[PDB]
Structure 1
Amino acid sequence: DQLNSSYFKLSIPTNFSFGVTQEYIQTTIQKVTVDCKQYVCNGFQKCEQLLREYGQFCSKINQALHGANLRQDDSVRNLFASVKSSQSSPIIPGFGGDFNLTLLEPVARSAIEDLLFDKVTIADPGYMQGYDDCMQQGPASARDLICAQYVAGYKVLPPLMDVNMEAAYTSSLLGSIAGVGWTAGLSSFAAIPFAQSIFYRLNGVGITQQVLSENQKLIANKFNQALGAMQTGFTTTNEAFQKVQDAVNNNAQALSKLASELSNTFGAISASIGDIIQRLDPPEQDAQIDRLINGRLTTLNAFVAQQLVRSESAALSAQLAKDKVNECVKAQSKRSGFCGQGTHIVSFVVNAPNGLYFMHVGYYPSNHIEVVSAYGLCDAANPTNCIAPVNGYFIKTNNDEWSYTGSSFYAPEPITSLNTKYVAPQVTYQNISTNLPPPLLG
């Protein structure tokens, strides 16, 4: 409620309660090429020599897919030139002193990134010898899309990067969080411990003055509780994990439509060219093969158009991911809602299938007592000497009449020259005379 006097009411909290927001940004789609001639005319000489009248449709399809894949490679190359950190501190098994970090690498990926890739249903693409595994075993189960290649006439291309170079990039990013996120310009790199960085981030935005941050090591306990409670729930209730699964499913559906449109007849006597050749004579053999040719060309054009739309959107979300790495991971953010909820403290990022996975640790206050508070304090004898608080409030303590509290946690303190600034007088300022804070003494 809003008072009528020259005071106001405060509603200040009494809990830290670190929380994790856990967002996912997609940066790429999987690269697919289509062998147009093989897809349409499945090795049948007659069909190919009927197709020669459709020469440029296949060229257009091939060129469009080639351009889309080049764009995907450019997007990943330019995203990982900002993820790159100029200077970094080596990762060692005990990295955050009292803060647990399961973001370290088990001798490669990290534990949370391994878990993210395991919990997700991804078909193995087989870049090494996926050719051999498909008759030494064949289709693994129903609708083996990653093995329907080498049959249908499409191919899944490998990503530009290993898992090892991607892990190297995100590890060098984790090794700079404390040091680049302390000072101004990212020209220099102060190699300070992680605990010092957390205490400076708390003393700063999540305004909690030095007395508390040096009066608690339950801060590390609450941080560890938040990070631990993260790594249990990669379940269906987790909404960013569902987005990762959605992206994987979109890749799979894109492939499955190609695989499934080869059994369509488009009105012919059969969907097999060999059957048509066997059953009919050339005059109407041609008329039946033409139906399949046109049907398959139109489905393939539709595939290309949808692939262009998908790559266009993924190229924009890659820029969003670059903005989040620069804004949330390499610095502490003043913007609300951009990184997570609460007030942003620190963010981490790992690789996810087809993109990046962010964990935003923020500060969540719980128990709000009210308080009565003053805009400023002036000396009654000398009403020109007036002070105001910095990053905090003047509170009427009920336990000197006036004390100081930090902005984000209720813990009253004596008023000193270190938490006040001299200001011009104002009608709403209190004219105290009896017991006078040191900054106001003459």
Structure 2
Amino acid sequence: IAFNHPIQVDQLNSSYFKLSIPTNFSFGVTQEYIQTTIQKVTVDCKQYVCNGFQKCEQLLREYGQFCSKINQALHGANLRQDDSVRNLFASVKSSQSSPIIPGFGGDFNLTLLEPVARSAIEDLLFDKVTIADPGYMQGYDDCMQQICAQYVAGYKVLPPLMDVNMEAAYTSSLLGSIAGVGWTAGLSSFAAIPFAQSIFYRLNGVGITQQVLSENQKLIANKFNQALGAMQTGFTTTNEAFQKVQDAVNNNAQALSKLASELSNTFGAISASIGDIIQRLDVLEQDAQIDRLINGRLTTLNAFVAQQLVRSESAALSAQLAKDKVNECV
């Protein structure tokens, strides 16, 4: 049986009622990923199709208008993603921040100060995940020494448009903002800002603690730092939330690569990548096989563009939800 039985309480006829009292703070929990954005990819038409051969390109000119429309649609989807990213980072313009302290917490062994630029927790998540999509005079150079995106010419990766280190600095400002924004004071105030403790205001909101219990909570805070350390250790694939981050990275990479393999490969058995490329010396025989092959490549590319448009629209809704979480939870 998979039944786990929820905890139960007994109703009392008398006005007085039995109550349940917690004994453990159990601070710290792993959390979900909102997806937010998709990898931006631009496909270069007239290069993957015809394998850069002039005779095929003359045949492609008849279908050139369709190829131009495909390029415009990909550019529009990437532009929509850029607009979503800037709107998400706009919430960081709030006038609340705390100067960073190397000793941010007196008894807190926190993983949030950058080692010296990508705070350790962001670095740990980046290290476990693997993405081959972005290469800058490194993967392309390594392939020559022996990514293949440029060599195949099927697709070209587009950079995120935001520096990761610059975004990491914005998250550090958000770490300063959390304590200041979460205060009784209206508008923006630095407040006590004691390593995001928010004095006792956060403590009273989470649970109706006593002042004597608040001193015990300070001792519990050292235990909470140890519990946060356990959460950092638990970055394994078994955690569903971490698996979701890996799945999103895998999905963007797999979609472009699988479709690119369909675009450039055996394709039709007679087509053999380029119809009659060495099979027929005569241009007319090669052209007839090539024309059938070109139409198949275009239809697969159209399916790729439609899939990317659906992914970009879903990402925009997911990014809006992520912005909503910053608006309320943060």
TM-score, normalised to structure 2, is 0.90
The 1:197–1:280 alpha-carbon spacing in structure 2 relative to 1, beyond 3 Å, is: same
- Please give the alpha-carbon distance, in whole angstroms, between the structure 2 residues aligned to 1:148 and 1:126: 9
Unpaired segments ≥5 residues, structure 1: 138-145, 330-442
Query: Which 10-residue stretch deviates more, 308-317 or 10-19?
Result: 10-19
- Indicate the SS of the match to 1:261: helix
- Residues 122 and 268 from structure 1, CA distance in 2 versus in 1: closer, same or farther, beyond 3 angstroms? closer
The 3 A distance-change label for structure 1 pair 215 and 268 is: closer
Q: Hey, what's the Cα distance between the residues in 1 that align with 2:313 and 2:133?
A: 25
Evaluate the alpha carbon distance shift between residue 4 and residue 129 of structure 1 in structure 2; reply closer, same or farther with a 3 A threshold: closer
Distance 1:158 1:128, change over 3 A: farther
Distance 1:12 1:191 in 2: 30
SS in 2 for 1:94: coil
C-alpha distance 228-307 of structure 1, shift in aligned 2 (>3 A): same
Shift of residue 113 of structure 1?
1.0
Q: Tell me the distance in 1 between the aligned counterparts of 2:196 and 2:235.
A: 27
Other structure's SS at 1:105 match: coil
Whether the aligned pair in 2 keeps the contact of 1:276 and 1:288 (CA below 8 Å) is no
Which has the larger share of helix?
2
Q: Post-superposition shift, 1:77?
A: 0.7
Q: Distance in 1 between matches of 2:159 and 2:196?
A: 40
Q: Please, which moves more after superposition, 7-16 or 304-313?
A: 7-16
Shift of 1:59: 0.9
- Bigger Rg, structure 1 or 2: 1
Cα 1:288–1:241 change in 2 (3 A) is same
Residue aligned with 2:197, SS = helix
Number of positions where the alignment pairs a residue of Structure 1 with one of Structure 2: 321
Residues 327-358 of structure 1 deviation map (CA, whole Å, 9 limit, x = unaligned)? 112xxxxxxxxxxxxxxxxxxxxxxxxxxxxx
Alpha-carbon distance in 2 for matches of 1:55, 1:234: 49
Q: Alignment identity in percent?
A: 99
**Unaligned 5+ residue runs, structure 2?**
1-9
Check conservation: 1:103, 1:110, Cα contact below 8 A.
yes
Residues 165 and 80 (structure 1 numbering): CA distance in 2 closer, same or farther, change over 3 Å? Answer: same
1:339-393 Cα shifts (integer Å, max 9, x gaps): xxxxxxxxxxxxxxxxxxxxxxxxxxxxxxxxxxxxxxxxxxxxxxxxxxxxxxx
2:66 and 2:299 mapped to 1: Cα distance? 10
CA separation of 1:275 and 1:148: change in aligned 2, threshold 3 A:
farther
User: Are 2:193 and 2:199, in contact at CA under 8 Å, matched by a contact in 1?
Assistant: no
Q: 1:303 to 1:280 in 2, by over 3 A?
A: same
The CA distance in 2 between the partners of 1:2 and 1:301, in whole Å, is: 63
Report if aligned partners of 1:234, 1:241 keep a CA contact under 8 Å in 2: yes
Local SS of the residue matching 1:288: helix
Whether contact under 8 Å (1:30, 1:251) holds in the other structure is yes
Kept in 1: contact 2:271–2:293 (CA 8 A): no
Q: Could you say which residue in structure 2 is the equivalent of 1:204?
A: 205
Offset of 1:195 from its aligned partner?
6.6
**Residue 127 and residue 96 in structure 1: after superposition, are their counterparts in 2 closer, same or farther (change >3 A)?**
same
Q: CA deviation at 1:298?
A: 0.5
RMSD, matched Cα: 2.0
Higher strand share: 1
User: Does the residue aligned with 2:156 lie in a helix, a strand or coil?
Assistant: strand
8 Å contact kept, 1:83–1:322: no
Displacement after TM superposition at 1:16 (Å): 1.5
Deviation at 1:126, TM superposition (A): 1.7
Deviation at 1:269, TM superposition (A): 2.3
Q: Using the TM superposition, give the Cα deviation of residue 14 of structure 1 relative to its aligned residue in structure 2, in angstroms.
A: 2.3
- Distance in 2 of aligned mates of 1:239 and 1:198: 33
CA distance in 1, matches of 2:229, 2:269: 60
State the Cα distance separating 1:148 from its structure 2 match. 3.1
1:197 match: secondary structure: coil
